[PDB]
Design a protein around this ligand. Sequence first.
Ligand SMILES: OC[C@H]1O[C@H](O[C@@H]2[C@H](O)[C@@H](O)[C@H](O[C@H]3[C@H](O)[C@@H](O)[C@H](O)O[C@@H]3CO)O[C@@H]2CO)[C@H](O)[C@@H](O)[C@H]1O
Ligand SMILES: OC[C@H]1O[C@H](O[C@@H]2[C@H](O)[C@@H](O)[C@H](O[C@H]3[C@H](O)[C@@H](O)[C@H](O)O[C@@H]3CO)O[C@@H]2CO)[C@H](O)[C@@H](O)[C@H]1O
Ligand SMILES: OC[C@H]1O[C@H](O[C@@H]2[C@H](O)[C@@H](O)[C@H](O[C@H]3[C@H](O)[C@@H](O)[C@H](O)O[C@@H]3CO)O[C@@H]2CO)[C@H](O)[C@@H](O)[C@H]1O
Ligand SMILES: OC[C@H]1O[C@H](O[C@@H]2[C@H](O)[C@@H](O)[C@H](O[C@H]3[C@H](O)[C@@H](O)[C@H](O)O[C@@H]3CO)O[C@@H]2CO)[C@H](O)[C@@H](O)[C@H]1O
Ligand SMILES: OC[C@H]1O[C@H](O[C@@H]2[C@H](O)[C@@H](O)[C@H](O[C@H]3[C@H](O)[C@@H](O)[C@H](O)O[C@@H]3CO)O[C@@H]2CO)[C@H](O)[C@@H](O)[C@H]1O
Lengths: 69, 69, 69, 69, 69
Amino acid sequence: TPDCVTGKVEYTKYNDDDTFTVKVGDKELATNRANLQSLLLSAQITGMTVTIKTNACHNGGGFSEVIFR
Amino acid sequence: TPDCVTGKVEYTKYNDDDTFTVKVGDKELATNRANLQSLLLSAQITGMTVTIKTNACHNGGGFSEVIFR
Amino acid sequence: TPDCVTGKVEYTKYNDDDTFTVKVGDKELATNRANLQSLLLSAQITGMTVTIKTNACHNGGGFSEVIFR
Amino acid sequence: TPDCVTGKVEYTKYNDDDTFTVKVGDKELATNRANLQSLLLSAQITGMTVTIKTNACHNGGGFSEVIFR
Amino acid sequence: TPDCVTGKVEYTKYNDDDTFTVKVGDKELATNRANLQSLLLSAQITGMTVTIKTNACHNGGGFSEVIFR
Ligand SMILES: OC[C@H]1O[C@H](O[C@@H]2[C@H](O)[C@@H](O)[C@H](O[C@H]3[C@H](O)[C@@H](O)[C@H](O)O[C@@H]3CO)O[C@@H]2CO)[C@H](O)[C@@H](O)[C@H]1O
Ligand SMILES: OC[C@H]1O[C@H](O[C@@H]2[C@H](O)[C@@H](O)[C@H](O[C@H]3[C@H](O)[C@@H](O)[C@H](O)O[C@@H]3CO)O[C@@H]2CO)[C@H](O)[C@@H](O)[C@H]1O
Ligand SMILES: OC[C@H]1O[C@H](O[C@@H]2[C@H](O)[C@@H](O)[C@H](O[C@H]3[C@H](O)[C@@H](O)[C@H](O)O[C@@H]3CO)O[C@@H]2CO)[C@H](O)[C@@H](O)[C@H]1O
Ligand SMILES: OC[C@H]1O[C@H](O[C@@H]2[C@H](O)[C@@H](O)[C@H](O[C@H]3[C@H](O)[C@@H](O)[C@H](O)O[C@@H]3CO)O[C@@H]2CO)[C@H](O)[C@@H](O)[C@H]1O
Ligand SMILES: OC[C@H]1O[C@H](O[C@@H]2[C@H](O)[C@@H](O)[C@H](O[C@H]3[C@H](O)[C@@H](O)[C@H](O)O[C@@H]3CO)O[C@@H]2CO)[C@H](O)[C@@H](O)[C@H]1O
């Protein structure tokens, strides 16, 4: 799966449908994997660099793959 | 969904019905989303600014949408 | 539900029946809500003040309501 | 249940059968309670003193009762 | 189960199939145990030394056993 955006998490958002949005770089991307919520908030709090891989690389696009560095 | 309140979390409370209350600004709001409990307490401990979006913007109103900054 | 004890968490204990005991103030109180375990240990580690509300305000009494401040 | 060992956690280990081993003092003990995994690793990271209570107080013995101080 | 790699966690990755990859030493290894995701990310953030034991000791190999030191 290709890299879409790499960077620090600017903000996260919990959605009415239980999905979770993350803003990294110039894109807001959303995931339906509940296990990733606490992991992503942890990366945001600690300032980790994350890479989000997705073929839906556009604002509002979905993802499931994330590299935490 | 419109913004209701934005600010640091003053206190959180676990309710007898397993819902979770948060006090931000001048409003106590509650959520039935279990996944938000650990995320909100983490935001409270670390001093994050949160924005709660809800149409029930009154004391005791419910919500599901939260932006963590 | 009336306030029972307010203070820092002195110690916590995981019980054989999966309930969880917290000592706050002059009382040991126990809860059967699994979701509260990680929340309470977090309060203990970070030194938060908690208020436990319960009508069984005696040693070994049960609770479900907790305010994290 | 009698106290078995009190001390700081030296190391923890996740096992193939989903049990979790902890080395405290001179004993390696294991638990089948999944809820204790994140609580014990948190105690390990923060340097908390824990007391494990069990009648199987020997290497490889099981436990479920833990006091976090 | 034999020791495969020991070292600090270089990066972690959440996979489309809900498995979780860790890079330690010269190998990426992945686990299907959900419970390990938060524990491994915590090890990564705090700089713990982990030892992964597995008989599939090759890049992309699976594992379930990990020692956190
Ligand atoms: O969390 C939401 C969602 O994330 C992942 O799927 C993403 C999009 O939601 C999905 O529409 C997209 O589909 C791809 C095909 O996989 C690809 O073969 C084709 O070339 O393009 C479409 C549209 O871009 O895939 C992305 C991930 O790359 C995840 O796979 C999915 O289960 C779900 O978790
Ligand atoms: O966690 C509790 C609850 O939060 C969200 O719902 C909120 C209120 O509980 C709900 O009564 C309120 O409904 C609104 C409609 O959104 C609005 O379209 C209609 O005109 O008026 C009613 C009454 O105010 O909505 C808020 C959130 O905006 C969440 O949506 C719900 O699933 C549940 O989680
Ligand atoms: O986690 C254990 C338990 O906590 C809460 O219940 C507490 C006691 O376990 C329960 O015996 C006690 O019952 C009260 C009645 O609610 C009250 O109406 C009556 O007058 O007195 C009895 C005895 O004090 O209530 C406390 C909490 O106040 C929680 O409600 C329960 O679901 C369970 O989680
Ligand atoms: O997590 C594993 C396991 O821990 C707890 O049980 C422990 C041992 O695994 C169990 O064999 C042992 O049983 C004792 C009885 O307590 C005692 O009354 C009897 O006389 O002898 C046997 C020793 O062979 O007890 C320890 C804990 O004391 C936990 O109770 C169990 O449910 C399980 O979680
Ligand atoms: O999380 C993935 C997976 O991890 C553990 O299994 C590992 C490999 O996935 C599995 O293919 C490998 O199988 C071994 C046999 O156990 C061994 O008897 C034989 O000699 O070699 C094969 C191939 O290497 O075992 C490793 C762990 O050593 C875990 O056991 C499994 O449940 C699953 O969680």
